[PDB]
Amino acid sequence: VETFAFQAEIAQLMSLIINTFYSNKEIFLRELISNSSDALDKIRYESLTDPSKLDSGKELHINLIPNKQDRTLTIVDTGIGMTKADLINNLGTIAKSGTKAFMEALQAGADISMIGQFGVGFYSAYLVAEKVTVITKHNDDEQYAWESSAGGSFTVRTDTGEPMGRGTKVILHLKEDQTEYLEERRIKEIVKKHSQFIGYPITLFVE
Ligand SMILES: CN1CCN(S(=O)(=O)c2cc(F)c(F)cc2-c2ccc3nc(N)nc(C(=O)N4Cc5ccccc5C4)c3c2)CC1
Question: With left for phi above 0 and alpha for psi between -120 and 50, is residue 203 left, alpha or beta?
Answer without folding.
Answer: beta
